Design a protein around this nucleic acid. Sequence first.
DNA 1: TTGACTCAACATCCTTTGCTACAA
DNA 2: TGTAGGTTTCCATGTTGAGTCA
Lengths: 435, 373
Amino acid sequence: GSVYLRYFKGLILSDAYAPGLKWSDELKAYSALAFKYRDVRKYFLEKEIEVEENVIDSLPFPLIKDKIELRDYQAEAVKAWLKEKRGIIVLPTGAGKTQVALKIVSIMKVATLIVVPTIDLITQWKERINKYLDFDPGIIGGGEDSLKGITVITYDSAYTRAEELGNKFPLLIFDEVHHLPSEGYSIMAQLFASPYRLGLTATPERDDGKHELYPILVGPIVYRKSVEELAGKYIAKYKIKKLYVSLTNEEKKRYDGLRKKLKDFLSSRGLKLQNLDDFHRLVKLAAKDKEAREALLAWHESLNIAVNSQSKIEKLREILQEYKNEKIIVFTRDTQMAYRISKTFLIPVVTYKTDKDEREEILQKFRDGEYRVIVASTVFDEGVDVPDATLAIVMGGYGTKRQFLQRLGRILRKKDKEALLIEIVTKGTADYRLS
Amino acid sequence: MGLPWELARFSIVKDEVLPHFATNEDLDLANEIISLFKAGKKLGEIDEEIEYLEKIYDHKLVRAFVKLLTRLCEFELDSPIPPIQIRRELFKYGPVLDEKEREDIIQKVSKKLGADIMRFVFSDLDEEKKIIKAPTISAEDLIRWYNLSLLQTLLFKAYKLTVYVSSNWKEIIRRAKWLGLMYFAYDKPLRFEFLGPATLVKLTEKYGRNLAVLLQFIISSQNWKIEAELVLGKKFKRVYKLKLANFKELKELVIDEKRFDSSVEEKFYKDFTNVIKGWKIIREPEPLVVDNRVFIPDFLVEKGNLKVYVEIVGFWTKEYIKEKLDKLKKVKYPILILLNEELGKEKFNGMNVITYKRKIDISLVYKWLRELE
DNA sequence: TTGACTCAACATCCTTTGCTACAA
DNA sequence: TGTAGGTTTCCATGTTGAGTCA
Ligand SMILES: [Cl-]
Ligand SMILES: [Cl-]
Ligand SMILES: [Cl-]
Ligand SMILES: [Cl-]
Ligand SMILES: [Cl-]
Ligand SMILES: [Cl-]
Ligand SMILES: [Cl-]
Ligand SMILES: [Cl-]
Ligand SMILES: [Cl-]
Ligand SMILES: [Mg+2]
Ligand SMILES: [Mg+2]
Ligand SMILES: [Mg+2]
Ligand SMILES: [Mg+2]
Ligand SMILES: [Mg+2]
Ligand SMILES: [Mg+2]
Ligand SMILES: [Mg+2]
Ligand SMILES: [Mg+2]
Ligand SMILES: [Mg+2]
Ligand SMILES: [Mg+2]
Ligand SMILES: [Mg+2]
Ligand SMILES: [Mg+2]
Ligand SMILES: [Mg+2]
Ligand SMILES: [Mg+2]
Ligand SMILES: [Mg+2]
């Protein structure tokens, strides 16, 4: 009957046996991970056993002003989340997801930690809290380590400082929540005890397959606006179009001679990878065997020849002949083809290899209009708040992952223009385009 | 210094770690790895030319060699003086779509400042860095330093480093005292059990590096029996053992003569000695042994019939101080502890421990000595 | 406050186009 | 998929936050 709920460095502990716990002698009480509070409390409040909770240690929530003129689908998302205050909202990149999260925390009026992947999103969330909420949130992670009121943090800093901050912030926000079900970030989410949890994303579907853990970690998808469908009060009409390039007859010789090594290696030793999800058995053999890694790196170089083929450059020139008054962002698979394009067509590159100031400066001049055409190596998938364009070219498929198409083909957030996207692929090879 | 975890090459035999070092049969490889790095050569030419060796020899070892030797070289930015502004003034001329127009643009640029900027476009990045001088080094020193770095990478994941003494006793405990290390002195075989980096929440880097300094000191000795209890695993962590002794195949290079000169200890010494003459001080009293468990305080302070053993602490956790007080609860001396602000600040058992920030406040020490007059 | 440099975590890495057509 | 098994992932390349020195 009488039972006491307590917290300790990422764990919840009590006396009565609740579903999801386990006996522990070091703690002399039934212990489990903290994220079960929002459930186990509801298991005792329904059993009418008058349990006292001593886990919520929220810091004093400062009074905040609401200045968000939210739209209608945003209000529907707010309602669908407010039902049980535990879920995920799927809205394409640039649909005002940050404003939705801010309105929700404004209604909640309870202390909150917003966990974001990059320093760029830290700055964006800080500026939008200063604008739409008129408050300076605690900036932990990166330069500063300030922890006040409503706070924002990186996933990395939230994991390294997890038990230090688990008993705080009754509400959690996960912008781009598809980064949470990783190895360490899953542990990070499990150590926290926030009963109220909201995840934000544009593309929730992971080719990884670990995207099942959402209801365990933050809750189910409570409202997802149909992706790439509502185009009236969103970005213009999507106009995906593919271009198939005849691969070079000179390159084709080496390509076939290079995939023959892998084909004959897999046929001669069995262990067929055709329609085999486990590509890991072959690398486990590759770490110790010589020809295993030889044929595997040969396969990798053959795929490289396929995606970064020079014949595609010809059609690039063609497209740049056609479009001369639209903002063009050309994507590629690797730094190699990015810099090849930069040297051939005189276009600034943006990779991880380019420094921070140079990256931000090319972004500044791209917004200004001084640079019309830019080339980048997949680095602009994130929510960096990169200025949109109209024409968006893709030269590196980077696999059929939803991120490098949805989260990449969602950096076009303008209106009253054509705004088409082109996928330049060679027909000879993999061209494993998203389904 | 150590190497990255994806180059740590080791095996497990019945819950016992065995690091795969480099024998003499591999010197040949090492030779080429030094003969590939010529003066005025770029890193791209290097890695591209060693893809053939990775198909023949162990790729992890080849990466280790090239990584270390690049850590030793002296690099040049590039020969053109404007490494970045080239693209500043050159990309402003729109996307070029004809070869004649591109050559016109490159000639206009080669007129605007004057240079061979057709090859010097993208400098200031890894692959295009050149070599000013080839660093002088032999193959045997290289394999010795690889082996030492591999061992340090292994020990970087350890939970406790037990070191067995051979002849020298006081030298290594003084080193541990002025390296901030967390130690327990036991006398069943007369060993020191140092807490490993895995006992820190987020402080592990400085402590592991200082522990590595003490390690490279231990390697120059008569014998060095060490039994490091390691914690390995990226998904789940299992505990293993790593025994090693008398492995005289390591580097006898610079010892970093002055890493920590114990300014806090001498400051406390000259502060205690010249502020009151009622309490005594001892430089380093003989360690108090209690049931094979050795307690090594830093100073003894006795004024008649009241003797206290004061000990200053560097790196520290809550568990460490709790365990040290629990052990010293049977030392028959009031134990005084001086904590540095290097973890979550605590005040439990205030009658045994005091904290400071940069130096020791002799006023607090005297107030505490007057609390037990 | 910088700017180096690293380094751990996290990501992708997979089967082949052909007789039903729309353009959303 | 489950009435058994012992164990560090990691052939590549890409990104970035974090944390160390001088
Ligand atoms: Cl109103
Ligand atoms: Cl303000
Ligand atoms: Cl969806
Ligand atoms: Cl639907
Ligand atoms: Cl490994
Ligand atoms: Cl052995
Ligand atoms: Cl071997
Ligand atoms: Cl000419
Ligand atoms: Cl006196
Ligand atoms: Mg107004
Ligand atoms: Mg308006
Ligand atoms: Mg679509
Ligand atoms: Mg052709
Ligand atoms: Mg397979
Ligand atoms: Mg700057
Ligand atoms: Mg031998
Ligand atoms: Mg010889
Ligand atoms: Mg001419
Ligand atoms: Mg010799
Ligand atoms: Mg005591
Ligand atoms: Mg300090
Ligand atoms: Mg990290
Ligand atoms: Mg992985
Ligand atoms: Mg700091």
